[PDB]
Amino acid sequence: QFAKPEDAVKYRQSALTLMASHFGRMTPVVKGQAPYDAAQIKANVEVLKTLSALPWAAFGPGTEGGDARPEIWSDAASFKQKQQAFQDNIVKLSAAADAGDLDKLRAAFGDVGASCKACHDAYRKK
Amino acid sequence: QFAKPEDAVKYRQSALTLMASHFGRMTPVVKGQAPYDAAQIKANVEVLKTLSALPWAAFGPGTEGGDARPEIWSDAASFKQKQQAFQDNIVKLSAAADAGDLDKLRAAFGDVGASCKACHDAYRKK
Numbered sequence: 405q406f407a408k409p410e411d412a413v414k415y416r417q418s419a420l421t422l423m424a425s426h427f428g429r430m431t432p433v434v435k436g437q438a439p440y441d442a443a444q445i446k447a448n449v450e451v452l453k454t455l456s457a458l459p460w461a462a463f464g465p466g467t468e469g470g471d472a473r474p475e476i477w478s479d480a481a482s483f484k485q486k487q488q489a490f491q492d493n494i495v496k497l498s499a500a501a502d503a504g505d506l507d508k509l510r511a512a513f514g515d516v517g518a519s520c521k522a523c524h525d526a527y528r529k530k
Numbered sequence: 531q532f533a534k535p536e537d538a539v540k541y542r543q544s545a546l547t548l549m550a551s552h553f554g555r556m557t558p559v560v561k562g563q564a565p566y567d568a569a570q571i572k573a574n575v576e577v578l579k580t581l582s583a584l585p586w587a588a589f590g591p592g593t594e595g596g597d598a599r600p601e602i603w604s605d606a607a608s609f610k611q612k613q614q615a616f617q618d619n620i621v622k623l624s625a626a627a628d629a630g631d632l633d634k635l636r637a638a639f640g641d642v643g644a645s646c647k648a649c650h651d652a653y654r655k656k
């Protein structure tokens with residue numbers, strides 16, 4: 405869907421920004437600093453679910469740029485396992501949110517965050 | 531969810547960018563230049579549905595900036611009717627996509643586009 409590689413870069417950056425917001429806005433809740441409203445979090449995690457699937461299609465062939473390391477393309481199978489692990493942890497977060505269980509939510513939240521960082525450590529420029 | 535007004539600006543700009551992409555990528559399909567796969571479009575419109583609800587919460591009190599005109603806040607009821615009309619036209623687009631009907635899709639697509647422009651004409655800086 406991208407006329408030029410820069411358009412793919414702008415899309416994925418925007419998608420990832422929207423993820424950081426829907427993920428990070430729950431930090432005060434999982435820390436207990438803000439109240440836990442199970443329905444609120446269920447709805448937010450549904451949004452995060454949808455967003456979490458979007459960036460990866462914008463790293464298609466020919467879309468080198470931004471802060472994406474070139475190894476995303478030369479090690480396509482590894483990069484796909486980091487996105488899959490992340491998306492599988494998002495499924496676990498959705499399950500915790502759907503269950504309305506704050507303990508399970510904070511554990512699942514931590515697993516998601518670790519998956520973000522694992523990908524950044526390998527595939528995002530400094 | 532925004533520490534500073536600039537964070538709300540960056541969020542809404544990112545959300546709107548993701549909308550322009552999920553909306554605009556269907557242009558070749560509604561023009562007949564690309565093939566119509568009803569399931570493909572149904573899935574894409576489901577993404578657009580979700581995205582279409584996101585920008586508005588990032589024009590909250592105190593978030594003046596970007597290319598948002600100040601009248602968004604001083605004429606809050608008018609701005610809310612432009613976002614509601616847009617979101618109602620998104621519902622009609624979802625119905626067309628769910629029905630798998632290209633005629634209905636192209637009419638609903640046109641109505642959505644007109645609603646984007648109507649809001650821009652009143653509330654987006656030049």
Ligand code: HEC
Pocket residue numbers: 413416417418420421423424427469470471472473483486487488490516517519520521523524527528529
């Ligand atoms: C690899 C499988 C990734 C996972 C999982 C996550 N992110 Fe990431 N992120 C990745 C790359 C390769 C990049 C660079 C993209 C580019 O072309 O520049 C990023 C970038 C971000 C950004 C910055 C976006 C911007 O506005 O420029 C943010 C805020 C970000 N990523 C956040 C984030 C979060 C919160 C994640 C888990 C919920 C996460 N990312 C996962 C690669 C990957």
Ligand code: HEC
Pocket residue numbers: 539542543544546547549550553595596597598599609612613614616642643645646647649650653654655
């Ligand atoms: C008012 C109810 C709007 C409707 C409906 C749509 N948009 Fe819009 N858009 C609006 C404003 C006030 C702004 C400025 C935001 C800011 O703070 O800068 C915008 C901006 C855009 C952008 C640019 C985003 C960026 O990266 O800076 C795009 C690409 C955009 N809008 C597209 C768009 C489309 C395709 C719409 C219908 C599907 C649409 N917008 C509706 C206000 C409103």
Ligand SMILES: O=C1O[C@H]([C@@H](O)CO)C(O)=C1O
Pocket residue numbers: 424427428517518520521
């Ligand atoms: O909210 C965020 O979480 C991850 C990372 O900090 C998790 O360790 C990230 O990159 C964000 O923007």
Ligand SMILES: O=C1O[C@H]([C@@H](O)CO)C(O)=C1O
Pocket residue numbers: 550553554643644646647
């Ligand atoms: O794809 C788009 O459609 C609207 C407008 O052009 C409809 O007339 C808009 O602002 C986009 O970025």
